[PDB]
Write a protein that binds this ligand. Structure first.
Ligand SMILES: *Cc1c(COP(=O)(O)O)cnc(C)c1O
Ligand SMILES: *Cc1c(COP(=O)(O)O)cnc(C)c1O
Lengths: 385, 385
């Protein structure tokens, strides 16, 4: 009858949070509109009003993806969860799957691919390598895979991958194209339909400035074919597209309960799509281009060296800087946080220990924050060791 | 170069939401403290401050679960996603899995079990059936399963399942116990450790009144054994416990990035655990008992008949009422919403069409809302057909 665990003393103090300027690869600081909807009251997860908001979010994804794919919806999970949803519904165990292992994203896409039992083919490329359209038409012709995965914005390495024709290509091989646009969406040009991409996904907490935990996905009719006619059943119920599609209104059938959508995160995601819709994709693209170029200038002035040699290959949203020799990078990062309240990051996966990563995302890709991060990284450079 | 999709006109209007009194099985209305943290700014998903909040959330789960299991953490997904996480790490394909199919929850637990390739054994019981400790010791002895699943609070049917000894039992069969306490946690007594439960999970949007999209989970050392020594790799990367455990600080090794936790939802979940810690589990349990009894009284007065005959079996958090003959239930539900701005629900799964469901959850389990829902359901009863 007696209680083993007593109420935690930490929980009896008020929730307090530090004020940080988040200039790493994400998540990023939230604009006022997005904090506001986050503080909103609940409505029924199946009210007609919730359905209306969901439908608006749908159009929002279609606008930012540039597509009319009826099979377009939010995944109730982080970026990873959309990637996993893409793979777990598309790949039968047995299917052949070709992955551009450019950075950690291609690796994760492999790890998942393996886990769901697939003939995965690692086109390994060193941290910084953007796959050649020449390397691709060889790789896929060679392995005749049902699916290719490619990272658009490689936030692990800072690479901006060209996408043109790969869609036209893959289609000729009866191959569907899967693109990770989590870091790239909103920050650089992308056209799901015109570039004939089959599965595009992005995440909430990058250029869109919504809080992390939701993600975005769209399937071309070809993918819709393959998924609705697979013999095997996806190893996941949570991520089962047939269920998700229906509840999200992509069917002929009335919405059936599947799982409880994250209502409040949807309010905030909605707003983030409203915001970029008001700005406009091209205006937003330009801002990210302009901010990144500015940031590049200042870093080079500091004596710092950009990690990606060719500028046309540089991801505007996440800039990667080689590590200043004679410096323990961790100090640099710590000094920025410790003295300026600013978050920047280091390497991830392949790029671990080899780079610093600086993000410029949505309402935060500004000349000012470029100034703040430069003036912070200058000071770091002065007294780090 | 030209843009197919134009910015959606719906997104160019401000986000507006109706004011609803949510008295169904969840999600429920949010208290002020929980709306406030929801409107908070972002911090680094890997800042020491985020780690501190996560650790406080951990204690919070340990307190509300009544456990010291080191393997205790939040799942970045709805209730379903915790259930799926439990199953996908515990069950090897081949393993024998025994499920109390009392309501839709047992069914979902089957569907998943099948999907991950398991020897699932459906102890079907009609909508309302609480498994007999007698039916259990037979079923599990018979099938020698590695895992049993049982719904604690059956929100599909309104049944409150007894749990005592099943833990002691299952252990004697070298069987791990898995309990769904999503609807029951905070609202009725439950003691993970004292009742020797092996895997307990709950969800954020029921009695805790946090927004939907996160969930809670804990593994006993026995489960921790089985999971860290399975030969096969879980069909999911997102839900892989080895990765999740590490990032959540349950390891000897420093936290490695896995996926981006939903920072803002964590703020809100934290607060919801702070709130129940201040109230206290027994005080909260009593409130739900008192409110439910009150609600029961009023429903019976209306001529309405409680769906679960024996009162000791009634889930305090979700009350189920048989459908008044001569009434199309959908009208009743609609009339409540249309005239009173109140949400109540109907059947789900097995109980579809056969019942109405009324939820009493956390700060919302109050005599007042019992009054409001009674006075709304009286009026409905007057002029429904
Ligand atoms: C941030 C990011 C993701 C999202 O990962 P989560 O942590 O799961 O949200 C996915 N892909 C890329 C390329 C990213 O930069
Ligand atoms: C509400 C509830 C859940 C949660 O389901 P999600 O919609 O995935 O959050 C799980 N189990 C039971 C018994 C519930 O009442």
């Amino acid at each position: 009858h007696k209680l083993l665990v007593t109420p935690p003393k930490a929980l009896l103090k008020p929730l307090s949070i530090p004020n940080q300027l988040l200039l790493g690869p994400g998540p990023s600081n939230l604009p006022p509109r997005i904090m506001a909807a986050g503080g909103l009251q609940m409505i029924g997860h199946m009210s007609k009003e919730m359905y209306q908001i969901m439908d608006e979010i749908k159009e929002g994804i279609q606008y930012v993806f540039q597509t009319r794919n009826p099979l377009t919806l939010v995944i109730s999970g982080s970026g990873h969860c959309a990637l996993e949803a893409a793979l777990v519904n598309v790949l039968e165990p047995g299917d052949s799957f070709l992955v551009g292992a450019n950075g950690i994203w291609g690796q994760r896409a492999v790890d998942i691919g393996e886990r769901i039992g697939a003939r995965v083919h690692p086109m390994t490329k060193d941290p910084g390598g953007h796959y050649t359209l020449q390397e691709v038409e060889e790789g896929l012709a060679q392995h005749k895979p049902v699916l290719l995965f490619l990272t658009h914005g490689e936030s692990s390495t800072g690479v901006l991958q060209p996408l043109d024709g790969f869609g036209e290509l893959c289609h000729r091989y009866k191959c569907l194209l899967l693109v990770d646009s989590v870091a790239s969406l909103g920050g650089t040009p992308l056209y799901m339909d015109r570039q004939g991409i089959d599965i595009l996904y992005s995440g909430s907490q990058k250029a869109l400035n919504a809080p992390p935990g939701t993600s975005l996905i769209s399937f071309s009719d070809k993918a819709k074919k393959k998924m609705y006619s697979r013999k095997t059943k996806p190893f996941s119920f949570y991520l089962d597209i047939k269920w998700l599609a229906n509840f999200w209104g992509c069917d002929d059938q009335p919405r059936m309960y599947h799982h409880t959508i994250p209502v409040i995160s949807l309010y905030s995601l909605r707003e983030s799509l409203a915001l970029i819709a008001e700005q406009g994709l091209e205006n937003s693209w330009r801002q990210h281009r302009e901010a990144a170029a500015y940031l590049h200038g200042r870093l080079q002035a500091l004596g710092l060296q950009l990690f990606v040699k060719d500028p046309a290959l540089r991801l505007p949203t996440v800039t990667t800087v080689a590590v200043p020799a004679g410096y323990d990078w961790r100090d640099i990062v710590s000094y920025v946080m410790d003295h300026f309240d600013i978050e920047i990051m280091g390497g991830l996966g392949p790029s671990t220990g080899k780079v610093l990563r600086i993000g410029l995302l949505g309402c935060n890709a500004t000349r000012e924050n470029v100034d703040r991060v430069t003036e912070a990284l200058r000071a770091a450079l002065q007294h780090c060791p």
